[PDB]
């Protein structure tokens, strides 16, 4: 199976730069392009452009041009992305994908790494405060992330083993700052008779946490 | 530059039955060799871009038969017959033929699965919360098709509410809504009940979801 595996998510500051790295494995790295793609906020797909990562020669999109500059480090099968003085509409998910070469005929972005979400803001990073949801047949339990930055966040309940009836909600805004949220739904009659804690970690400000959902 | 257009942003399907996803391109895609350079490409809710089909009619390893591509010249269709829960997402156009490489905007799939009302749970901000200063209200409504749906909040009806979607479920085809009030503790602590009134096409009046702040 062909894996990529690019690089965490990147808080970078107005006008710095930043480079992403997407690692292959489960063929040979130097025989096929590496190609690039920017994905933004609203879902759109750009191709950014390709490296050869044999020779060497890439060839890039008019519109990255003088923005991305792609590398290769054949000893660690590692293809590099390097973004220049970076504003905020350089702020998006970036992918790389390979595309395959056979008997003649390409297959262009046949399979893609996970992404790598890049934030282009001058805020510094704040540590999350997690609140537990207590309630006022089956009964919903709740957990509030508030006011943390930059994404992402990790959540899981009983530390991950409880993971059906859950919905962790999207990240959103509110003046510079994220706020996530997750309900899990059991029946009455496992809880409050059986424990369930929160377990948020929030690696960019190097925080971990657990809260025990309390009756009121 | 090659424009792809995708014209219709989304297409309700209830499942056992065909789609065709049309995408046109500013010029056509044949090339000398005989292959048409028109690519499919589908991203799942909370995944990575995965490559469908290839050179406009030939399927991607792992692609269910279900799937097909056809087209002239200009205009191309991806035919998928019986739709399946696990169909959902964003399904991209893109040319391969010409410098620089684009892609259409993306017609987002939805399965039309039966109505099902909003299960709706209303949870009053935690102790941890007012201890630091300020207030959220969080309103989950969890598990409901369509996804159209207005949520109002009263409280003795106001604004500084943060709201936040999931992606169609997967495995059961619904929508879920997290609505979360944020106040102030001087603006909390000041008014008595909160409610969480919900329009949604399968209701006579709307569902509501209430608290009073001394009351448990």
């Known amino acids: 199976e062909v894996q990529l595996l690019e690089s965490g998510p990147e808080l970078v500051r107005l006008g710095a730069s930043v480079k992403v790295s997407c690692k292959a494995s489960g063929y040979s790295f130097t025989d096929y392009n590496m190609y690039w793609v920017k994905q933004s906020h609203g879902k759109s797909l750009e191709w950014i452009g390709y490296?050869?990562?044999?020779?060497?020669?890439?060839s890039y999109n008019q519109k990255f041009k003088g923005k991305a500059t792609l590398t290769v480090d054949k000893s660690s099968s590692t293809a590099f992305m390097h973004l220049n003085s970076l504003t905020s509409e350089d702020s998006a998910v970036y992918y790389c994908?390979?595309?395959?070469?056979?008997?003649?005929?390409?297959?262009?972005?046949?399979?893609w790494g996970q992404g790598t979400s890049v934030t282009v803001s001058s805020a510094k990073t704040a540590a999350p405060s997690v609140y537990p949801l207590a309630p006022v047949s089956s009964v919903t339990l709740g957990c509030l992330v508030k006011g943390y930055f930059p994404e992402p966040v990790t959540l899981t309940w009983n530390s991950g083993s409880l993971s059906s009836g859950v919905h962790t909600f999207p990240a959103v805004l509110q003046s510079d700052l994220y706020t996530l949220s997750s309900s899990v739904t059991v029946t009455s009659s496992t809880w409050p008779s059986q424990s369930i804690t929160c377990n948020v970690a929030h690696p960019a400000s190097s925080t971990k946490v657990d809260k025990k959902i309390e009756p009121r | 530059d090659i424009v792809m257009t995708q014209a219709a942003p989304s297409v309700p399907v209830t499942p056992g039955e065909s789609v065709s996803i049309s995408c046109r391109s500013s010029k056509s895609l044949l090339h000398s060799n005989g292959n048409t350079y028109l690519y499919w490409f589908l991203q799942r809710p909370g995944q990575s871009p995965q490559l469908l089909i290839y050179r406009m009619s030939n399927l991607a390893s792992g692609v269910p038969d279900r799937f097909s591509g056809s087209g002239s010249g200009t205009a191309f269709t991806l035919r998928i017959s019986k739709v399946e829960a696990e169909d959902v997402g964003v399904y991209y156009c893109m040319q391969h033929l010409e410098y620089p490489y684009t892609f259409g905007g993306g017609t987002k799939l939805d399965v039309k699965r039966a109505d099902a009302a909003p299960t709706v749970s209303i949870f009053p901000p935690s102790s941890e919360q007012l201890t630091s200063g300020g207030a959220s209200v969080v309103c989950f409504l969890n598990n409901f098709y369509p996804k159209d749906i207005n949520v109002k909040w009263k409280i003795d009806r106001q604004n500084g509410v943060l709201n936040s979607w999931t992606d169609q479920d997967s495995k059961d085809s619904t929508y879920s809504m997290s609505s979360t009030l944020t106040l102030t503790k001087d603006e909390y602590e000041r008014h008595n009940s909160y409610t969480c009134e919900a329009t949604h096409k399968t209701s006579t009046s709307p569902i509501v979801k209430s608290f009073n702040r001394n009351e448990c």
């Open positions: 994908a390979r595309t395959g070469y056979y008997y003649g005929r390409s297959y262009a972005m046949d399979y």
């Open positions: 490296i050869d990562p044999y020779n060497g020669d890439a």
